[PDB]
Design a binder for this molecule. Sequence first.
Ligand SMILES: *[C@@H]1O[C@H](CO)[C@@H](O[C@@H]2O[C@H](CO)[C@@H](O[C@@H]3O[C@H](CO)[C@@H](O)[C@H](O)[C@@H]3O)[C@H](O)[C@H]2NC(C)=O)[C@H](O)[C@H]1NC(C)=O
Ligand SMILES: *[C@@H]1O[C@H](CO)[C@@H](O[C@@H]2O[C@H](CO)[C@@H](O[C@@H]3O[C@H](CO)[C@@H](O)[C@H](O)[C@@H]3O)[C@H](O)[C@H]2NC(C)=O)[C@H](O)[C@H]1NC(C)=O
Ligand SMILES: *[C@@H]1O[C@H](CO)[C@@H](O[C@@H]2O[C@H](CO)[C@@H](O[C@@H]3O[C@H](CO)[C@@H](O)[C@H](O)[C@@H]3O)[C@H](O)[C@H]2NC(C)=O)[C@H](O)[C@H]1NC(C)=O
Ligand SMILES: *[C@@H]1O[C@H](CO)[C@@H](O[C@@H]2O[C@H](CO)[C@@H](O[C@@H]3O[C@H](CO)[C@@H](O)[C@H](O)[C@@H]3O)[C@H](O)[C@H]2NC(C)=O)[C@H](O)[C@H]1NC(C)=O
Ligand SMILES: CCC[C@@H](CCO)Nc1nc(N)nc2c3ccccc3n(Cc3cc(CN[C@H]4CCOC4)ccc3OC)c12
Ligand SMILES: CCC[C@@H](CCO)Nc1nc(N)nc2c3ccccc3n(Cc3cc(CN[C@H]4CCOC4)ccc3OC)c12
Ligand SMILES: *[C@@H]1O[C@H](CO)[C@@H](O)[C@H](O)[C@H]1NC(C)=O
Ligand SMILES: *[C@@H]1O[C@H](CO)[C@@H](O)[C@H](O)[C@H]1NC(C)=O
Ligand SMILES: *[C@@H]1O[C@H](CO)[C@@H](O)[C@H](O)[C@H]1NC(C)=O
Ligand SMILES: *[C@@H]1O[C@H](CO)[C@@H](O)[C@H](O)[C@H]1NC(C)=O
Ligand SMILES: *[C@@H]1O[C@H](CO)[C@@H](O)[C@H](O)[C@H]1NC(C)=O
Ligand SMILES: *[C@@H]1O[C@H](CO)[C@@H](O)[C@H](O)[C@H]1NC(C)=O
Ligand SMILES: *[C@@H]1O[C@H](CO)[C@@H](O)[C@H](O)[C@H]1NC(C)=O
Ligand SMILES: *[C@@H]1O[C@H](CO)[C@@H](O)[C@H](O)[C@H]1NC(C)=O
Ligand SMILES: *[C@@H]1O[C@H](CO)[C@@H](O)[C@H](O)[C@H]1NC(C)=O
Ligand SMILES: *[C@@H]1O[C@H](CO)[C@@H](O)[C@H](O)[C@H]1NC(C)=O
Ligand SMILES: *[C@@H]1O[C@H](CO)[C@@H](O)[C@H](O)[C@H]1NC(C)=O
Ligand SMILES: *[C@@H]1O[C@H](CO)[C@@H](O)[C@H](O)[C@H]1NC(C)=O
Ligand SMILES: *[C@@H]1O[C@H](CO)[C@@H](O)[C@H](O)[C@H]1NC(C)=O
Ligand SMILES: *[C@@H]1O[C@H](CO)[C@@H](O)[C@H](O)[C@H]1NC(C)=O
Ligand SMILES: *[C@@H]1O[C@H](CO)[C@@H](O)[C@H](O)[C@H]1NC(C)=O
Ligand SMILES: *[C@@H]1O[C@H](CO)[C@@H](O)[C@H](O)[C@H]1NC(C)=O
Ligand code: NI
Ligand code: NI
Lengths: 747, 747
Amino acid sequence: RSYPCDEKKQNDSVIAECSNRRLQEVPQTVGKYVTELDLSDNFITHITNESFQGLQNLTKINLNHNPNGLNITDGAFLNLKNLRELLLEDNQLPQIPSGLPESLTELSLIQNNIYNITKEGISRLINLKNLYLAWNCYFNKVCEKTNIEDGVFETLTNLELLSLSFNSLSHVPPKLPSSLRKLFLSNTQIKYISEEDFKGLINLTLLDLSGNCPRCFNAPFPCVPCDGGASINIDRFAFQNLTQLRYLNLSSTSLRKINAAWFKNMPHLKVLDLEFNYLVGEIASGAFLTMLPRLEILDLSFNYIKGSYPQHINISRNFSKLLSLRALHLRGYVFQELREDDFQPLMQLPNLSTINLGINFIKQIDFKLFQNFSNLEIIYLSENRISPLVEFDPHSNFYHFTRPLIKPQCAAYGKALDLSLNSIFFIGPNQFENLPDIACLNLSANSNAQVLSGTEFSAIPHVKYLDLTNNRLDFDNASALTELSDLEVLDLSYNSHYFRIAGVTHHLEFIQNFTNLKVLNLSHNNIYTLTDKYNLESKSLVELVFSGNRLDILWNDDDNRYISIFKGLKNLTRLDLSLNRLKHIPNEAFLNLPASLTELHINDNMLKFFNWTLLQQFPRLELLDLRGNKLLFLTDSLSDFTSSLRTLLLSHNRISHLPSGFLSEVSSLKHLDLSSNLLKTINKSALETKTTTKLSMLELHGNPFECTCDIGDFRRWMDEHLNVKIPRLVDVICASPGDQRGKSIVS
Amino acid sequence: RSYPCDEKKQNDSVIAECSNRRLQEVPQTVGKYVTELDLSDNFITHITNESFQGLQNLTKINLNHNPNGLNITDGAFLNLKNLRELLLEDNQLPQIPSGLPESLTELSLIQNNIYNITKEGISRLINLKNLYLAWNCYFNKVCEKTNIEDGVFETLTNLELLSLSFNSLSHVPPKLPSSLRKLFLSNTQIKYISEEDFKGLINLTLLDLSGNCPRCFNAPFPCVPCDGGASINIDRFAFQNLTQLRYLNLSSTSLRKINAAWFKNMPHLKVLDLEFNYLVGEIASGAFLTMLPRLEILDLSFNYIKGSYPQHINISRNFSKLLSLRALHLRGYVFQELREDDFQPLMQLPNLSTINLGINFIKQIDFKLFQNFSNLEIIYLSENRISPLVEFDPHSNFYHFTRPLIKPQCAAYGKALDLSLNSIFFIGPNQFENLPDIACLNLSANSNAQVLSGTEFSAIPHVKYLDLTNNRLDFDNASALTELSDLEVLDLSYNSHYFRIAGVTHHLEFIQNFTNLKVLNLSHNNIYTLTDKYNLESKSLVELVFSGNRLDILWNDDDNRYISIFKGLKNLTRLDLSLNRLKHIPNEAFLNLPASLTELHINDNMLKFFNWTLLQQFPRLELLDLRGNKLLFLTDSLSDFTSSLRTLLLSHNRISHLPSGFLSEVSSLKHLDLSSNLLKTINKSALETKTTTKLSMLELHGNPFECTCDIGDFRRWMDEHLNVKIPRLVDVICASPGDQRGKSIVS
Ligand SMILES: *[C@@H]1O[C@H](CO)[C@@H](O[C@@H]2O[C@H](CO)[C@@H](O[C@@H]3O[C@H](CO)[C@@H](O)[C@H](O)[C@@H]3O)[C@H](O)[C@H]2NC(C)=O)[C@H](O)[C@H]1NC(C)=O
Ligand SMILES: *[C@@H]1O[C@H](CO)[C@@H](O[C@@H]2O[C@H](CO)[C@@H](O[C@@H]3O[C@H](CO)[C@@H](O)[C@H](O)[C@@H]3O)[C@H](O)[C@H]2NC(C)=O)[C@H](O)[C@H]1NC(C)=O
Ligand SMILES: *[C@@H]1O[C@H](CO)[C@@H](O[C@@H]2O[C@H](CO)[C@@H](O[C@@H]3O[C@H](CO)[C@@H](O)[C@H](O)[C@@H]3O)[C@H](O)[C@H]2NC(C)=O)[C@H](O)[C@H]1NC(C)=O
Ligand SMILES: *[C@@H]1O[C@H](CO)[C@@H](O[C@@H]2O[C@H](CO)[C@@H](O[C@@H]3O[C@H](CO)[C@@H](O)[C@H](O)[C@@H]3O)[C@H](O)[C@H]2NC(C)=O)[C@H](O)[C@H]1NC(C)=O
Ligand SMILES: CCC[C@@H](CCO)Nc1nc(N)nc2c3ccccc3n(Cc3cc(CN[C@H]4CCOC4)ccc3OC)c12
Ligand SMILES: CCC[C@@H](CCO)Nc1nc(N)nc2c3ccccc3n(Cc3cc(CN[C@H]4CCOC4)ccc3OC)c12
Ligand SMILES: *[C@@H]1O[C@H](CO)[C@@H](O)[C@H](O)[C@H]1NC(C)=O
Ligand SMILES: *[C@@H]1O[C@H](CO)[C@@H](O)[C@H](O)[C@H]1NC(C)=O
Ligand SMILES: *[C@@H]1O[C@H](CO)[C@@H](O)[C@H](O)[C@H]1NC(C)=O
Ligand SMILES: *[C@@H]1O[C@H](CO)[C@@H](O)[C@H](O)[C@H]1NC(C)=O
Ligand SMILES: *[C@@H]1O[C@H](CO)[C@@H](O)[C@H](O)[C@H]1NC(C)=O
Ligand SMILES: *[C@@H]1O[C@H](CO)[C@@H](O)[C@H](O)[C@H]1NC(C)=O
Ligand SMILES: *[C@@H]1O[C@H](CO)[C@@H](O)[C@H](O)[C@H]1NC(C)=O
Ligand SMILES: *[C@@H]1O[C@H](CO)[C@@H](O)[C@H](O)[C@H]1NC(C)=O
Ligand SMILES: *[C@@H]1O[C@H](CO)[C@@H](O)[C@H](O)[C@H]1NC(C)=O
Ligand SMILES: *[C@@H]1O[C@H](CO)[C@@H](O)[C@H](O)[C@H]1NC(C)=O
Ligand SMILES: *[C@@H]1O[C@H](CO)[C@@H](O)[C@H](O)[C@H]1NC(C)=O
Ligand SMILES: *[C@@H]1O[C@H](CO)[C@@H](O)[C@H](O)[C@H]1NC(C)=O
Ligand SMILES: *[C@@H]1O[C@H](CO)[C@@H](O)[C@H](O)[C@H]1NC(C)=O
Ligand SMILES: *[C@@H]1O[C@H](CO)[C@@H](O)[C@H](O)[C@H]1NC(C)=O
Ligand SMILES: *[C@@H]1O[C@H](CO)[C@@H](O)[C@H](O)[C@H]1NC(C)=O
Ligand SMILES: *[C@@H]1O[C@H](CO)[C@@H](O)[C@H](O)[C@H]1NC(C)=O
Ligand code: NI
Ligand code: NI
C-alpha cells in the first residue's frame, strides 16, 4: 500500500494527496504513475534535483506552506520535463527559484519575500500561461519595493494571466505581452494610469486596479491613502484599446467622478466593481450608466458618506439603461427608508434577479415595490434595522465575500427574501401584506419572541423553506406555522429561550399538520420538557435534526413520557441525536426509533453502553454514527444483528479490544472507523473473513498501538488485504515500546 | 507520599480525598490519622469487615455512587467504633445494610432500592441524629411501596432529622420520636393529614408535605394528581402542637383554600412555601396572612390559573399584616401590568428586601412604585415581556433554585434591579425616569441593539455594576455610558453582533472616561477591528477580560495598529487573553502589555511559541497561564527571566522534554502544572535544586511516561522531595512498555 501519500484517480490524472503529514522531506516512495503531488502543509525545508528524481510523470507539484523558508536549489525541478504546474506559495522564498523548467504553464509564488522579478528567474519560461506573484510586499510587512526588470514579461508570449497585486509597484509595468487576458494590479500603489500602460493589451478581458488610492476610513487592514485622499488618476484614453474587457475592478480607488467615455471602447463590459469609493453623487446622476448596456453585475457597495444618514437612496434614472443587469449590489450606501418611488429606475430592467441591500441601516421598506420587478429572484436585506411594519485569503475577493447571498437549498424553491439580522421582533397581521409570492424566507436573528399561531404568514402561504433560527420564539400554540401548507424545510435551530424554562408551556404539535414537511431542524433548543403532547408526529418528515437538546433528560430512566418521542415520524430516514448529553439510551426508547431509518447519528454524547442487538429492528439502517462517546467494548455478534449496515463510525471512543470474528460475517459493512480509540493491538481473527465481504475502508489512526512482535499479525493482515484502504498511515503510530514510539506501524 | 488518596487537614479532621479515582476496591493504604474517607464515584463493588480494618480513627465514610450495586456484608462497618457519618447514596442497595455500628449519628441511604424500613436495620442505631432515606421509590421507577415497620423510629430517641421524601408512603408513619426537629415527607403520596400524625412532635421546626396531591399541569417530571385534582386534606387540628414550627413546605399540594387557623399554634413560622398551588383567590383575600406576623419568607410562585392572563396582580390588603416579611416570591402568577395601586399593601412592610416577579409575562411597569419601599434591596423582574416604556439533585430544593437572584458581587453595591431576559430593545430618554437610586443594574438579554451615547442612564447615574451581556449593542459613540461616573464593574460580554461586521464603525474610547472603573469584561465579542482609536486606555482599570475575541487578527504580523492595544491600561493587574485563536504573539505586542500585571492568562489559544525572555519586563507577574496551547518546548533559563513568578500553568501542551536545571534556581515558583503534556521521562537534573526553593505543587498526570529503568530517577526524586505535592498519582500513569501500561508510576 502507498505510503505516506493517499492516491486517488481524478479523470486523466493520479493525485498523491500527501499534505499535512509532518513530512520533514519529500518522500522517495511516490508512485511512478502519480501525475499530481500535493506536499502542502508539511515541514519540508529543502528541495534539490534528487527530491523528485525519476518521477517523470509529474505534471503538478504543490509545495505551499513549507516548512510549516523553503530552500530550493538552482535547477532542482529542471529534470521534470512534464512539469506544468508548480505551486510555491507561503514558502518565505527570497527570490524566484533559479533554473525552473521551461515546461511550466502555471507558476504561483504568492505570499513569499520576492521583491525582484528578473529575466534570470522567468525569461526562459516561454510556455507560462498563468503567473501569480501577489502578496509579496503589503500592509506593514517589512519588505522592499518591487523591482520589475525592464521587459521581464516581454518573452512570455503565451502569458494569459499575470497577478502582481499586493506588491509595491508604483507604475503599471511596461512591455507586457499582448497575449494577456487577465491583469491583476490591486493594492500596488499605482496612483496614475497613463494612456500607454495597456496600449497593446487588445485581448484583455479582466483588469483589476482596485486599492490604488484607497478609501481608508474604517479599513480592516493597514491602509495608506493617496495625498489628500485623492482618487486614482486615469488618463482619458487609458482604456481605448480594451475592446474585449469583461471585468473591471475599480473598488477602493477613491473615485468621486466616473468618466462615461472610459466605457466608450468597452462594448462587452460584464462586471464592474466600484465598491469602497465616494460615488453617492455619481449614483444619483451617473452618465457612465448610459455606456453599459451589456453589464450584468454592478457592485456599488460601501460608497456611504461618513456622517450622512439620509432618509432615502437616490438612484439615477440612468440605471434604467442597464438593460442586461442581473445583480445590483448596494450594500453600505446607508439610508433610513426604501420607498416605491426610489427604485422606479430598476423596475424596467428585465433580468435584474439579485438586489443586495445588506448593511444600509434601513429602518422601513414599502415591501409592495418588490411586486413590480420582472425576474427578481433574490431580495437580500440582511443586516439592516428593519422593525415591525407600522489573514486575507489571496485566492478570494478582498472587497466582498463570494458565497451565495442566500443558501442555494432555500433559493432553489423560488423567490427568496432574506430579512435576517434585522429587528422584526413581532410579525403583525400586515407585515407581509404587499409582498410578492415568496418561496424562501429567512427571518434568522430578528429577536423574535412571539407565539406563532397560524396566521402570521397568511399573505405568503407558499413558503417552502423557512429559516427562523437564532430568535427567542415561544412555541406556545399548536397551530403555529400551519398556514404554510406547502412548507418543506423548516429551521427552528437556536430558539432555546423559552424551551429552557420548565415553568412555561411548550407546544410542538404543529409539526404533524404539514403534509409536505421533509426536513425539520430543532437543533440547539435545549428541549427537555413539553406540555401535554410528548411526541413528534409526521407522515411526511424525512430528516429530523435534534442535536443540542436534552434527550438525557427526556429519556431519563425514571420517566416513561418521552419513550416514543420520534416513533410517529413514520417516513423518517435521517435522525441526528448528537450533542444530547446521553449516557445511555433506554432499550424501549431505542426500539421506538422509526424502523424506516437509514442514517442514525448519536455522535458527541457520553454513551457508556450501546445495545447492538437492537439493530435487528432497523432493516434499512445503512449508517450508524457513534463517534465521540465513551464506549468501552464492541459486540462479537454484529453479523447476527444487521444485514444492511454499510458505515459504522466509532472514532473517539474507549474501545481497547476488537473481538475475534468482529467483521468475519458482516458482509454489508463497507466503512469502519475505529480511529482514536484505545486499541493496543489487533488480532488476525478480529479482521479476517472466511467469505467475500464489502469492507473497503478501515480507519485506525490515533490508537496507542503496542509495536512488539504481537503487532506482526495485524501488519501481515494489512499486506494480505490491500483492497481495504487504511487512510492516514503516518498517524497509525506506535505508542510503545520506547524504541518504536512515534513511528508508523507500516515502518 | 500517600496513595491513592490526597490528604488534607480541615480543622480537627484529616480528609482522605479518594473520590473519582477508578478504585475497584477500598485501598489498604489509607493513612492511620485519616478521620474522614471520601471514596465516592469509584468502581467499588464489595464492602466487608476487612475493607476498613484497623482504621479506628474514621468518623466519616462516603461511599456514594459506587460502583460507577454495592455489596455490603452484615457487620462490615461494625468494628469502626468511632464511625459517626456513613454516606451510602446511589449504591443500588436492596435493603438497609445489616449490623451497622451503634455509633452512627448520620446515615444517608438516598437514591437506593430500599422499600422496607425494618427494626433489624435501624432499631439499634439509638445515637442516630440524621436519617436520610429519600428517593428510593418515585416517578416511573419500577419499585415497591415503602413498608415502614411499626415503631421502627420509636427507639431513635435522639433522631432530629428524618427524610422519607420521594417514597410511596400513603400515610405519615406513626410512633415518630418526640426529638424530631425536621421531618421531610415530600412526594410521598400522603393525601390526608390526620390530627394524630404530628401529635407528639412538640420540638418540630420544619415540616415538608410538598408534592402530596400535586399540581401536575406542565410538570417537568412524571406527576400523578389526587382524584379530581383534589387538594391535600388537612384536619383542622393537624398542626395544633407544632408551636416551634419555623419552616412549612406545602408546595404542590393543589391547595385552593388556606385555613388561617392552621397557623394559630405556629407563633414563630418563618418560611412558608406555597408554590405550585391554585391560590390566586387566596392571594386576593387571604385571611391566613393575618396569622403570620413573624414570617420572613413567603413563596407563592407558580399559582397561575391556566388560560388566564389578567391585566393586574390582585394582592390582598392582608399582605400589610406580614410585618416581618423579608422576601416575597411571586413568580408565575401571570399578569400583564404592574401598577402603583397593585402593590400598596407591600409598601408599608418595613423589612421587605426582596421582591421576585420572575416569569409573569409582565409587559409594563410603573417603575415609580419601587421608590415607595423602606428597604427594598433586590427587585427581581427577570424573564418577563417588558418592552421600552411608552436528574433532580436530592440535596437541593425541588420547586425552585436556591442560588442568589442577583450576583452577590453586583448586589453588594446597593439597590439591585434585575431586568434581564426582557425586550427593552431601546432605552429611551424616560425609561429609568422614576426609578429609585439603583447601584446594580442587570439588562442582560434584552435584544438591545442601540448606540449608547452618554444620556440613557442619566436618571440612575450612580450605577456601580452594570451587566449588559447578551445583547446586540452597537458600540458607535465615544460617549457611551460616560454618564455613569461611579461605574466600577461593566460587563459587555456577548455583544458580538456589530463587532463581527468589518464595514460598520466600532468605538471603545468611552473606557478611558471612567475614573473608578475596576473590572471590564469584553468577552466573546469577536473584536477584530476598531475605528480610529485602536487602543484601550484607563488609569483605574484593574481587570480586563478579553477572552473570545480575535487578537489573532488584531496582532497579525502584517499590521502594527493594535500593538499597544492594552498598554494604556496603566493600573491593570489581571488580563485574560484566552480563546483569541493566537498562534504567536508579536514580541513588540507582548512587551506592550502593562508592566503592572500580576496575573496573565493566555490559555486555550493555539500558541506554538512563547518568548520566555520577555518575562524580564513584568517584575510583578505572579501567575502565567498558558494551558491548552501547542507549546513544543520550555526555556532552560526561566530563573534568569523572572524572580516573581509563583504559578506557571502549562497543562495541555506538547512539551516532550523538561530541560536540565529547569527549576533549580526559580526560587519563587510554588505551583507548576505540566499535566497532559508529552513527557516520556523526567531526568533528575530537570527537577533538582542546589538551593532552597518554594516549589510545593507539581502536576504531571496525563503524560505518556516510559516506565523502563530510565523512570527510576524521577521516582527517586519523588521519594526524596516529599514537600512537593504531586496530585492525582493514580493518573501519573505508565504509557509503555506493555507490561507497565496503565499502572501508576509510584506502583
Ligand atoms: C439566514 O441568514 C443567516 C444570517 O445571515 C445565515 O447564516 C449564516 O450561514 C452561513 C452558512 O451556514 C454561516 O457560515 C458558517 O460559519 C461557520 C463559522 O461561524 C463555519 O464553520 C461554516 O463553515 C460557515 O462558513 C454564517 O456564520 C451564518 N451567519 C450567522 C450570523 O449565523 C443563514 O445561512 C441564512 N439562511 C438561508 C436559508 O440562507
Ligand atoms: C438544520 O438542519 C438542516 C438539515 O440537515 C441543515 O441543512 C442542511 O445542511 C447540510 C450541511 O451544510 C447540507 O448538506 C450539504 O449540501 C451541500 C450542497 O448540496 C453538499 O455540497 C454537502 O456535501 C452537504 O451534503 C444540506 O443540503 C442542508 N439541507 C437543507 C434542506 O438545507 C441546516 O444547515 C441546519 N441549520 C443549522 C443552523 O445548523
Ligand atoms: C444578569 O442576568 C443573567 C440572566 O438571568 C444572569 O445570567 C445567569 O448567570 C448564572 C451565573 O453565572 C449562569 O449560571 C451558570 O450556568 C453555566 C451553564 O450554562 C454553568 O456552567 C455555571 O456554573 C453557572 O451555573 C446562568 O446560566 C446565566 N443565565 C443566562 C441566561 O445567561 C446574570 O448572572 C445576571 N447578572 C448579575 C450581575 O446578576
Ligand atoms: C466577566 O468578567 C468578570 C470578571 O472576571 C466576571 O466576574 C467575575 O467572575 C468570577 C468567576 O465567577 C468571580 O470569581 C469568583 O468569586 C466567588 C465569590 O467571591 C469566589 O467564591 C470564587 O472562588 C471566584 O473567585 C468574580 O468575583 C467576578 N467578578 C465580579 C467583579 O463580578 C463575569 O462573570 C464575566 N461575565 C461573564 C458573562 O462571563
Ligand atoms: C456602513 C456605515 C458604517 C457607519 C459609518 C458612520 O460614519 N455607520 C454606522 N455604524 C454603526 N456602527 N452603527 C450605525 C447606526 C445605527 C443606527 C442607525 C444608523 C446607523 N449608522 C449609519 C450612520 C449614522 C450616523 C449618525 N451616528 C451618530 C448617532 C449616534 O452616534 C453617532 C451617521 C452616518 C451614518 O452612516 C454613514 C451606523
Ligand atoms: C407561567 C405560565 C406558563 C403558561 C401557562 C398557560 O396556561 N403561559 C405562557 N406560556 C408561554 N410559553 N408563553 C406565554 C406568553 C407569551 C406572551 C404573553 C403571555 C404569555 N403567557 C401567559 C398566558 C397566556 C395565555 C394566552 N395564550 C394564548 C395566546 C397564544 O396562544 C395561546 C393564557 C394564559 C397565560 O398564562 C397563564 C404564556
Ligand atoms: C508513467 O506512467 C506510465 C503509465 O501509468 C508508466 O507506464 C510509466 O512507467 C511511468 N513512468 C515513470 C517514469 O514512472
Ligand atoms: C544533481 O546535481 C549534481 C550536481 O550538483 C549532480 O552531480 C547529480 O548527478 C545531479 N543529480 C541528478 C539526479 O540529476
Ligand atoms: C540552502 O541550502 C544550501 C545547502 O544545501 C546552502 O548552501 C544555502 O545557503 C541554503 N540557503 C539558505 C537561504 O539558507
Ligand atoms: C490575443 O492577442 C495576442 C496579440 O494581440 C496574441 O498573442 C494571442 O495569441 C491572441 N489570442 C489568440 C487566441 O490568438
Ligand atoms: C412598475 O414598473 C414600471 C416599469 O416596468 C413603472 O413604469 C411603473 O411606474 C411601476 N409602478 C409602480 C407602482 O411602482
Ligand atoms: C392558537 O392561537 C390562535 C390565534 O391566536 C387562537 O385562536 C387559538 O385559540 C390558539 N390555540 C390555543 C390552544 O390556545
Ligand atoms: C416520504 O418521503 C418521500 C421523499 O423522500 C416522499 O416522496 C413521500 O411522499 C413521503 N411519504 C409520505 C407518506 O408523505
Ligand atoms: C438489549 O435490549 C433487550 C430488549 O430490550 C434487552 O433484553 C437486553 O438486556 C439488552 N441488552 C443488554 C446488553 O442490556
Ligand atoms: C489515630 O490517630 C492518632 C493521632 O493522629 C494516632 O496516635 C493513632 O495511632 C491513630 N490510631 C489508629 C488506630 O490508627
Ligand atoms: C471478619 O469476619 C470473619 C467471619 O465472617 C472473621 O473470621 C474475621 O476474623 C473477621 N475479621 C475482622 C477483621 O474482624
Ligand atoms: C454479595 O457477595 C457475597 C459474596 O461475597 C454473596 O454471597 C452475596 O450473594 C452477594 N450479594 C449480592 C446481592 O449479589
Ligand atoms: C425536644 O423534645 C423531645 C421531647 O418532647 C426531647 O426528646 C428532646 O430532647 C427535646 N429537646 C431537648 C434539647 O431536650
Ligand atoms: C407609599 O407607601 C405608603 C405606606 O408606607 C402608602 O400609604 C402610600 O399610599 C404610598 N404612596 C404611593 C404614591 O404609592
Ligand atoms: C454621540 O452621541 C451624542 C448624543 O446622541 C451626540 O451628541 C454626539 O455628537 C455623538 N458623538 C459622535 C462622535 O458622533
Ligand atoms: C488602581 O487600583 C486600585 C485598586 O486595586 C485603586 O485603589 C487605585 O486607585 C487604582 N489607581 C488609579 C490611579 O486609579
Ligand atoms: C524575544 O524577544 C526579543 C525582543 O523582542 C527578540 O530579540 C528575541 O528574538 C525573541 N526571542 C525569540 C526566541 O524569538
Ligand atoms: Ni483474509
Ligand atoms: Ni534535591
